[PDB]
Every structure is written in C-alpha cells, then in structure tokens.
Design a binder for this molecule. Structure first.
Ligand SMILES: *[C@@H]1O[C@H](CO)[C@@H](O[C@@H]2O[C@H](CO)[C@@H](O[C@@H]3O[C@H](CO[C@H]4O[C@H](CO[C@H]5O[C@H](CO)[C@@H](O)[C@H](O)[C@@H]5O[C@H]5O[C@H](CO)[C@@H](O)[C@H](O)[C@@H]5O)[C@@H](O)[C@H](O[C@H]5O[C@H](CO)[C@@H](O)[C@H](O)[C@@H]5O)[C@@H]4O)[C@@H](O)[C@H](O[C@H]4O[C@H](CO)[C@@H](O)[C@H](O)[C@@H]4O[C@H]4O[C@H](CO)[C@@H](O)[C@H](O)[C@@H]4O[C@H]4O[C@H](CO)[C@@H](O)[C@H](O)[C@@H]4O)[C@@H]3O)[C@H](O)[C@H]2NC(C)=O)[C@H](O)[C@H]1NC(C)=O
Ligand SMILES: *[C@@H]1O[C@H](CO)[C@@H](O[C@@H]2O[C@H](CO)[C@@H](O[C@@H]3O[C@H](CO[C@H]4O[C@H](CO[C@H]5O[C@H](CO)[C@@H](O)[C@H](O)[C@@H]5O)[C@@H](O)[C@H](O[C@H]5O[C@H](CO)[C@@H](O)[C@H](O)[C@@H]5O)[C@@H]4O)[C@@H](O)[C@H](O[C@H]4O[C@H](CO)[C@@H](O)[C@H](O)[C@@H]4O[C@H]4O[C@H](CO)[C@@H](O)[C@H](O)[C@@H]4O[C@H]4O[C@H](CO)[C@@H](O)[C@H](O)[C@@H]4O)[C@@H]3O)[C@H](O)[C@H]2NC(C)=O)[C@H](O)[C@H]1NC(C)=O
Ligand SMILES: *[C@@H]1O[C@H](CO)[C@@H](O[C@@H]2O[C@H](CO)[C@@H](O[C@@H]3O[C@H](CO[C@H]4O[C@H](CO)[C@@H](O)[C@H](O)[C@@H]4O)[C@@H](O)[C@H](O[C@H]4O[C@H](CO)[C@@H](O)[C@H](O)[C@@H]4O[C@H]4O[C@H](CO)[C@@H](O)[C@H](O)[C@@H]4O[C@H]4O[C@H](CO)[C@@H](O)[C@H](O)[C@@H]4O)[C@@H]3O)[C@H](O)[C@H]2NC(C)=O)[C@H](O)[C@H]1NC(C)=O
Ligand SMILES: *[C@@H]1O[C@H](CO)[C@@H](O[C@@H]2O[C@H](CO)[C@@H](O[C@@H]3O[C@H](CO)[C@@H](O)[C@H](O[C@H]4O[C@H](CO)[C@@H](O)[C@H](O)[C@@H]4O[C@H]4O[C@H](CO)[C@@H](O)[C@H](O)[C@@H]4O)[C@@H]3O)[C@H](O)[C@H]2NC(C)=O)[C@H](O)[C@H]1NC(C)=O
Ligand SMILES: *[C@@H]1O[C@H](CO)[C@@H](O[C@@H]2O[C@H](CO)[C@@H](O[C@@H]3O[C@H](CO)[C@@H](O)[C@H](O)[C@@H]3O)[C@H](O)[C@H]2NC(C)=O)[C@H](O)[C@H]1NC(C)=O
Ligand SMILES: *[C@@H]1O[C@H](CO)[C@@H](O[C@@H]2O[C@H](CO)[C@@H](O[C@@H]3O[C@H](CO)[C@@H](O)[C@H](O)[C@@H]3O)[C@H](O)[C@H]2NC(C)=O)[C@H](O)[C@H]1NC(C)=O
Ligand SMILES: *[C@@H]1O[C@H](CO)[C@@H](O[C@@H]2O[C@H](CO)[C@@H](O)[C@H](O)[C@H]2NC(C)=O)[C@H](O)[C@H]1NC(C)=O
Ligand SMILES: *[C@@H]1O[C@H](CO)[C@@H](O)[C@H](O)[C@H]1NC(C)=O
Lengths: 48, 204, 49, 230
C-alpha cells in the first residue's frame, strides 16, 4: 500500500476555536492580561 | 513518445534505437512479431526479464531513452514499441520502431501510381492508389499532395508485408470526391524511405 | 507492538498485527497539562501536555 | 500464466462492445499487478485502454484508471472470485476496430507512495480481432486499372469495398506466374475491406491481346472477370 508513516489529523479551525475559548479561562486565575504560550513535551518516557 | 520509423542491421551488428519524451524512469520496451502478440523485452530502463538474452539493454540519457540490441539474428525481426508512465497514472506508447534482420541486399523503393478509372468516376467515387514495393527496411511512411499543398484527408496506409523475393511491399489508399479530383490537375504521392523520398504524379 | 504501560516490569504485551488499513475517529474531550516552574511568575506562563 | 480473451469478433456500429479475459495460473486478488486492456488497431501503434485493482486504501474501495479519450465510452470491471477481467465499450464505431489484448500491468503496484503507479505490461494475451461494421456481407466492386515504363509497363485490377475476407485474384486464370503480384487487404473507415493486384507485361504485347483478371469471392458469391485497356 501507501509507503507512509502513521499520521493523526486535526482540523485547524476546530482546534483553534477551542484554544481561544480555553485560553480565556486560564485568565480567570492567571490574571486578566498576560501572555500564555503553548509548547510540546519537555522530555521523558515515550508515554509521556 | 517519438520512436524512429525504421531501423536496419546485419547479423552480428549492434543496433541502438531511441525514444524521447520520457522524463521518468518508468520507460519500457516491447517486441511484437508480425501476426503475433507483443512481448515485453525490458522494464525499469536497463533491467531484463526472465528468458531474455543479455544482449538487450535499456538506457536513458536526459529526456531520451534508448534500447540496444547486439548480435542480431533472424528472430529479432519485429516491431519495437516503447512506453512509459506519464503524469499521475496514465501510460502512453510510441509509434514503435520497425527493426528488420532480413537477408541482403538493401534497395530503393519503387512507386507506381494509378489515377481513378472512368468506370469508377461513374459511381461518383475517386480513389488513387500508390503501390510501393521492393524496399529495405520494411518500414516506409507515405505522403500525399495536390498540385503543391499536401492532402491530410482520406489517407489510408497499411503496414508493409514481405514478398516472395523477400522484398517488402505496401499500398496506400486515397479516397476523395470527384469534384476535387477534376478541379486539381495533378496529384502527387510522396514515399519517404530512409530519409530519401520517391515521388509520383498523375493528371487527367 | 511491544509495550509496558503503567511502568509494569515482568510483563510485556505484544500487540498482534491487523489485516488491512486501520481508520478511526474519536472525540478529543480534554487534556492533561503542566505549568513550567521557571518564574518570572509575574511575567508570563507556558503550558505543556 | 496465460491470458485468454473471449467475446464477439464482429460487432455492429454504435452498439456496445463487450470482451472478457479469463486468467489461468494467477489470482486477480493478487496485489502485485493491475489488470486491464491494451488495443492495437490494424497496422498501427499500441494504445492504452485502462486497468483497475480492488486492492485499496483507507479512503477508497479500489482504484480504476481510464484513458482520457476512451473514458466516456468504456467501463472496466474485475471479478475476483471467478478470476475474470471485463471490458465494455458503449457507442462503438468502426474507428474502435482493433486487436484487443488482455493486459497485466506491472510497476509500483505492490509498494507505492500516495496512489499506485502501473507503467508496463509484463504479461500479454494472445488477443482477438474485433471489427466494427454498420453493414452486412458485401460484394466487391471491380474496376480496371489502365497503365501508361522501362520497356515493360504495369497494370492491375482494383478491388473496392467488400466484407469479409478473402478474395483471390488471378491473371488470365493462372496463365501468368512470373511477373505477377498481389497486395494485402486494407480496412476502411466504413468497416469494409479493400485490396488490389499488379502485373508487368511488355509494351509489344499491347494489342488484340488483352489482360483479364479473375476475381473470386466465396462469402458474397462473386466471380467477376474484367478486361483492362489503357
Ligand atoms: C489528513 O489530511 C490530509 C489533507 O491535509 C488528507 O489528505 C487528502 O486525502 C484525500 C483522500 O484521503 C485526497 O483526496 C483524493 O485525492 C486523489 C488525488 O488527487 C490529486 O489528483 C487529482 C487528479 O489530477 C489529475 O487529473 C486531473 C483531471 O484530469 C488533472 O486536472 C490533474 O492535473 C491531474 O492530471 C494529470 O494526471 C492525469 C491522469 O494521470 C493525466 O491525464 C494528466 O495529463 C496529468 O498528467 C487532482 O484532481 C487533485 O487536485 C485536487 O486537489 C488539489 C490539492 O492542491 C487542488 O488544488 C485541486 O484544485 C483539486 O481540488 C489532486 O492533485 C483523488 O484522485 C481522489 O478522488 C478520487 O477518488 C474519489 C473517491 O470517492 C472519487 O470520487 C473521485 O472521482 C476520484 O476518482 C478518480 O480517481 C481515482 C484514483 O484517485 C480512481 O480510482 C477513480 O476511478 C477515478 O479515476 C478516474 O478519474 C481520473 C481523474 O481524476 C482519471 O485519471 C482516471 O483515468 C479515471 O477516469 C481523492 O479526492 C486528498 O488529495 C488529500 N489531500 C492532501 C493535501 O494530501 C488525509 O487523507 C487526511 N488523513 C486522514 C487519515 O483522513
Ligand atoms: C488491502 O490489501 C488487501 C489485500 O492484501 C485488499 O484485500 C482485497 O480486497 C478485494 C476487494 O474487496 C477483495 O476482492 C473481493 O473478493 C471477494 C471474495 O473474496 C474471497 O475470495 C477471494 C478469492 O479466492 C480465490 O482466489 C484465491 C487466490 O487465487 C484462492 O487462494 C482461493 O482458494 C480462491 O480460489 C479470496 O482472496 C478472499 O480472501 C480474502 O478474505 C479472507 C477473509 O474472507 C482473508 O482471510 C484472506 O486473507 C483474503 O484477504 C475471499 O476468500 C468478492 O466477493 C468481492 O467482491 C465484492 O466486493 C467488492 C468490494 O470489496 C465489490 O467491488 C464487488 O463488486 C463485490 O461486491 C458485490 O458482491 C458482493 C457479494 O459478492 C455483495 O455483497 C456486494 O453488495 C456487491 O453486490 C452488489 O453489487 C454487484 C455489482 O458490484 C451486483 O452485481 C450485486 O447484485 C449487488 O447489487 C471482492 O472482489 C480481495 O479478496 C481482498 N484480498 C486480496 C488478497 O486481494 C484490500 O482491498 C486492500 N485495502 C484495504 C482498505 O483493505
Ligand atoms: C472512540 O470512539 C470511537 C467511536 O465509537 C471509536 O471508533 C470506533 O472504532 C472501531 C474500530 O476500532 C470501529 O469498529 C469498526 O466498525 C465498523 C462498522 O461496523 C458496522 O458496519 C459493518 C458493515 O461494514 C457491519 O457488518 C457491522 O456489524 C457494524 O454494524 C467496521 O467496518 C470495522 O471493521 C473494520 O475496521 C477494523 C479496524 O477499525 C478492522 O479491524 C476490521 O477488520 C475492518 O477492516 C476491514 O474492513 C474495511 C472495510 O470495512 C477495510 O477497509 C479494511 O482494510 C479491512 O479489510 C481487510 O481486513 C478484513 C479483516 O480485518 C478482511 O475481511 C478484508 O477482506 C480485508 O482483508 C470495525 O469493526 C467502530 O465502528 C468505531 N466507532 C464508530 C461509531 O464507528 C474509537 O475507536 C474510540 N477510541 C478508542 C481509543 O477506542
Ligand atoms: C476526519 O475524517 C472525517 C471523515 O472523513 C472528516 O469528516 C468529514 O469531512 C468531510 C469534509 O470535511 C465531510 O464530507 C462532506 O460531507 C457532506 C455532508 O456532510 C457531503 O455532502 C460532501 O460531499 C460532497 O463533496 C464531495 C467532495 O467534494 C463529493 O465527492 C460529493 O459527491 C459531494 O458533492 C455533492 O453535493 C454537491 C452539493 O453540495 C452537488 O452539487 C454534487 O452534485 C454532489 O451531489 C462531503 O463529502 C464529511 O461529511 C465529514 N464526516 C463526518 C462524519 O463529519 C474530518 O474532517 C477529518 N478530520 C481531519 C482533521 O482530517
Ligand atoms: C481561528 O478562529 C477564528 C475565529 O476567532 C477564525 O476566523 C474565522 O475566519 C473566517 C474566514 O476564514 C470568518 O468567516 C468570514 O465571515 C464573515 C462574516 O460572515 C465574512 O464577511 C467573510 O467573508 C468570511 O466568510 C469567520 O467569521 C472567522 N471567525 C469568527 C468567529 O469571526 C479562523 O478561521 C480560525 N482559524 C482558521 C484555521 O481559519
Ligand atoms: C518539540 O519541538 C522541539 C522544537 O522543534 C524539538 O526540538 C528539536 O530537537 C531536535 C533533536 O531531536 C533538535 O535537533 C538538534 O539541532 C541542533 C541545532 O542544529 C543540533 O545541535 C543537535 O545536534 C540536533 O541536531 C532541534 O534543533 C530541536 N528544535 C529546535 C527548534 O531547536 C523537540 O524534539 C520536539 N519534541 C518532540 C517530543 O518531538
Ligand atoms: C462525539 O460527539 C458527538 C456529538 O456530541 C457524538 O455524536 C452524538 O451522538 C449522540 C448519541 O445519542 C446523538 O444523540 C447526537 O445527535 C450525536 N451528535 C450529533 C451532532 O448528531 C459522538 O457520538 C461523540 N463520539 C463518540 C465516540 O461517541
Ligand atoms: C480584571 O478585570 C476586571 C473586569 O473584567 C476588573 O474589575 C479588574 O480590575 C481587573 N483586574 C486587573 C486589571 O488587575
């Protein structure tokens, strides 16, 4: 079949909308105005 | 794909036939004996299949693909087609190259052109027939002209066939209306054999 | 195919191969997140899975 | 591995051409190759028809490739259990008259990237000739060819539209052997057949001595002799 590596799909519009709604909820704690940056896993076991 | 119309060689000599229009490596060549089915003699450029002699080798340089047959023999006389994958999944074939390993000796073709008859014109039909014979190799292209300008309509040309004297022969049939036959005085028939051409002309 | 989840030692499971192409659709209903310790607490905050 | 083509060798114009290939020694289920057809019109080059394969991926139930020109009028089909290949051509014309070969396509079929890529036919069939005609059995129209070189000229007899083959043309009923020639048949755009003959005779023989060819056609029941004069 296809010579490919396994892949996972996420729709750009749907993930973004949630992020925008979620990032506002963190500001009910971390303060009205602040910069929230997202980043991938730090490091560890593969499961992590 | 553009494949040369003809190719000739003596037994033991090496022949190289080309093909152009191949941008990929999917190039493949085929061998079809007259009155038989085509057989694949090469694939994936140079690579050979089962039961195929070492003397068949594929090659591709730039946009040009090439087949090479060394040590010619009787069984090598056939029509050779090339083909390759193009675009997404489509595949095309060349016009094919006719390679002949016939006995000696080489000779210029011979043309005899016959204008429509009087009885034929009575049926409101006009047909001119070019008879080409006694040529080597066995592949010839035929062209038609009226006075000066060429004739692209009504042209029927057939693959040549070997004769009793071992010389190949072919016939092209031009069918048109009697109106255009009487209007245009002379009708020329051009027969191209290995670069050199042989011409005939008829007028009522 | 060979996995030890839940930090299990002494037992490793081999996931058997599956005939054909596997396709699956699931809902993503939530996340597991961590906050960085580097602070600069009053400046900005970064979150990671 | 053997490919056996089967179906009608004679079909009428504008109708549906159907042909079926029977494979032996291999499975149509096998994902190593594609199955399709390649047609070769009489005295012409090889033209690709199409091929398909049920061996699919996650977004399709298979793959099917059609030649852009023949796409509208053709349908390709594979029977996996019965190991058979099918070809159906709608609205067929005498231009579609060809020797159809059952073709097995090799290439990047067993290990491809994105879509599968078939490029060459490794295994052929013997093939069958399908002739498309809008008419029935017809008798040939005979017209004489009047000559004019080199001390001895050439004259012949013209054999016009007929069907089916063969036709035997002899000069003076086998009176002359040396210097006698006959050209093969030609398929017309109207689905019919045509050919001719030629003989070389001295100019000194021109006179009360004339030449007559004997035409013979078994299917249409035609025996016609015609004298040739310049
Ligand atoms: C995660 O997300 C990923 C996205 O980020 C996602 O990837 C996407 O996956 C889906 C499927 O999962 C993909 O969708 C498929 O794409 C296939 C390939 O599409 C490409 O190719 C076609 C064809 O292009 C040729 O033909 C046209 C028309 O002639 C020409 O205009 C082209 O220039 C080109 O022509 C060359 O080739 C010809 C043939 O060799 C030559 O004759 C010619 O001379 C040229 O050399 C293009 O149309 C596509 O363009 C489209 O997409 C681009 C993207 O940039 C747009 O810009 C553009 O505007 C177009 O929208 C593209 O380039 C499709 O073939 C496939 O559709 C087929 O299958 C469906 C199944 O339902 C059928 O309904 C449909 O009709 C198609 O069937 C035909 O094709 C199949 C084989 O694919 C045959 O089996 C079938 O019988 C039928 O063939 C017939 O038609 C053929 C012409 O189409 C003809 O050649 C045959 O002979 C026969 O008659 C489907 O849409 C999608 O592309 C992926 N996208 C990306 C970005 O990766 C991933 O899946 C996600 N992951 C998961 C897990 O979900
Ligand atoms: C991934 O790769 C794999 C390959 O590794 C791909 O798998 C292949 O997929 C194709 C497509 O489905 C399969 O073809 C189907 O075949 C079945 C019959 O299968 C049985 O018989 C096969 C042949 O056996 C013979 O040959 C072998 C080899 O020589 C020989 O050893 C054997 O003794 C025997 O002589 C077997 O190969 C096959 O084995 C497979 O399955 C086993 C489990 O059953 C498994 O253990 C094996 O390892 C192997 O994988 C099996 O025994 C056909 O019935 C079927 O035809 C229907 O389905 C297709 C779509 O799948 C459809 O297009 C057809 O039109 C047809 O559908 C009609 O008929 C159905 C009933 O027959 C009916 O239910 C449908 O509703 C439909 O009917 C309607 O429409 C028709 C018109 O279409 C109409 O007339 C009706 O009235 C009605 O309206 C397929 O052709 C291959 O078998 C399969 N395997 C291989 C090895 O190729 C796979 O596709 C790839 N992709 C994905 C995503 O997985
Ligand atoms: C979170 O939740 C979501 C949603 O609940 C979960 O998604 C679920 O994922 C399941 C798979 O893990 C999936 O189960 C599938 O159900 C499909 C539908 O079944 C119904 O329809 C059929 C008719 O098609 C009915 O007969 C049946 O009774 C049901 O009513 C099945 O079609 C699926 O089978 C196929 O997929 C699985 C893997 O997903 C294969 O193991 C299986 O063999 C099947 O794959 C074959 O068939 C497809 C075509 O159908 C081929 O494309 C494919 O290549 C395979 O074909 C080859 O292999 C078979 C043998 O395997 C062979 O016979 C054949 O000839 C070929 O060789 C599967 O049963 C749930 O439906 C799905 N949920 C929903 C709502 O759809 C998600 O997993 C959850 N998340 C987690 C983490 O669990
Ligand atoms: C993960 O996978 C899932 C499943 O594949 C994805 O969810 C699917 O997303 C697709 C596209 O986003 C969506 O497909 C459309 O569904 C519509 C119904 O909801 C269909 O109507 C539509 O079909 C038309 O378009 C196709 C492609 O252009 C044509 O092939 C088809 O014939 C249709 O065209 C018709 O309709 C027009 C008028 O609209 C008419 O003029 C034509 O004549 C013809 O009749 C699409 O197929 C699926 O519905 C989604 N599935 C689900 C369950 O939601 C998801 O997006 C994937 N996620 C990621 C991140 O990749
Ligand atoms: C990320 O989320 C934002 C919303 O916060 C998405 O912006 C959306 O962009 C589309 C255009 O691509 C907007 O549609 C537009 O609608 C207006 C009004 O009908 C129309 O005038 C435009 O022509 C266009 O159709 C959409 O309204 C907008 N969202 C909101 C809430 O306004 C963005 O699309 C998301 N990311 C991605 C992947 O685009
Ligand atoms: C999460 O995303 C980050 C950002 O891309 C990934 O970090 C990347 O890690 C690779 C190592 O696997 C880095 O390659 C390294 O490049 C440097 C500079 O050339 C070189 O000195 C090293 O020898 C190595 O080649 C890569 O640079 C780095 N990305 C960046 C932007 O620096 C990280 O891997 C991702 N995490 C996971 C789990 O995927
Ligand atoms: C993912 O979410 C969707 C929507 O919440 C689920 O689909 C719903 O299923 C219920 C079952 O009773 C229906 O009543 C709803 O109508 C469905 N939604 C829509 C929009 O129609 C879906 O089931 C969820 N995923 C899983 C795996 O269950
Ligand atoms: C946060 O916002 C609320 C109103 O949304 C306001 O009353 C409060 O003063 C703000 N806190 C700040 C800016 O620190």
């Amino acid at each position: 079949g296809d010579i490919r590596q396994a892949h996972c799909n996420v729709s750009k519009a749907t993930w973004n909308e949630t992020l925008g709604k979620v990032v506002k909820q963190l500001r009910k704690h971390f303060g009205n105005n602040t910069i929230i940056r997202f980043a991938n896993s730090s490091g560890g076991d593969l499961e992590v | 794909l553009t494949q040369p119309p003809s190719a000739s060689g003596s037994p033991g000599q090496s022949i190289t036939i080309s093909c152009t229009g191949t941008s990929n490596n999917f190039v493949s060549w085929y061998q079809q004996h007259a009155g038989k089915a085509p057989k694949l003699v090469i694939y994936d450029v140079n690579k050979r299949p089962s039961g195929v002699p070492d003397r068949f080798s594929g090659s591709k340089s730039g946009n040009t693909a090439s087949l090479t047959v060394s040590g010619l023999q009787t069984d090598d006389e056939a029509v050779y087609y090339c083909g390759s994958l193009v675009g997404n999944w489509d595949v095309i074939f060349g016009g094919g190259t006719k390679l002949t390993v016939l006995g000696q000796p080489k000779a210029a073709p011979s043309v005899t052109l016959f204008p429509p008859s009087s009885e034929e014109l009575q049926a409101n039909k006009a047909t001119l027939v070019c008879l080409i014979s006694d040529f080597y190799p066995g592949a010839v292209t035929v062209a038609w002209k009226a006075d000066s300008s060429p004739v692209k309509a009504g042209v029927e040309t057939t693959t040549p066939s070997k004769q009793s004297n071992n010389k190949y022969a072919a016939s092209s049939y031009l069918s048109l209306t009697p109106e255009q036959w009487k209007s245009h005085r002379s009708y020329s028939c051009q027969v191209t054999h290995e670069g050199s051409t042989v011409e005939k002309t008829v007028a009522p | 195919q060979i996995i030890n989840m839940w930090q299990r030692i002494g037992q490793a499971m081999y996931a058997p191969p599956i005939q054909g192409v596997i396709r699956c659709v699931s809902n993503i209903t939530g996340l597991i997140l961590t906050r960085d310790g580097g602070s600069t607490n009053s400046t900005t905050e970064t979150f990671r899975p | 591995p053997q490919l056996q083509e089967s179906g009608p060798t004679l079909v009428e114009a504008s109708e549906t051409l159907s042909l079926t290939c029977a494979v032996s020694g291999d499975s149509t289920a096998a994902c190593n190759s594609f199955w399709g057809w390649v047609r070769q019109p009489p005295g012409k080059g090889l033209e690709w028809v199409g091929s398909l394969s049920h061996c699919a991926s996650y977004w399709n139930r298979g793959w099917t490739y059609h030649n852009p020109s023949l796409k509208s009028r053709l349908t390709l089909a594979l029977d996996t259990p019965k190991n058979l290949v099918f070809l159906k051509l709608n609205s067929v014309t005498a231009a579609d008259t060809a020797t159809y070969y059952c073709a097995r396509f090799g290439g990047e079929v067993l290990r491809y990237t994105d879509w599968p890529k078939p490029a060459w036919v490794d295994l052929w069939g013997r093939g069958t000739l399908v002739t498309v005609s809008s008419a029935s059995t017809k008798g040939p129209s005979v017209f004489p060819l009047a000559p004019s070189s080199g001390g001895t000229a050439a004259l012949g007899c013209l054999v016009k539209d007929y069907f089916p083959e063969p036709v035997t043309v002899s000069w003076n009923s086998g009176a002359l052997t040396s210097g006698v020639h006959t050209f093969p048949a030609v398929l017309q755009s109207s689905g019919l057949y045509s050919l001719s003959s030629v003989v070389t005779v001295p100019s000194s023989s021109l006179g009360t001595q004339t030449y007559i060819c004997n035409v013979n056609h078994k299917p249409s029941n035609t025996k016609v002799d015609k004298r040739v004069e310049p």
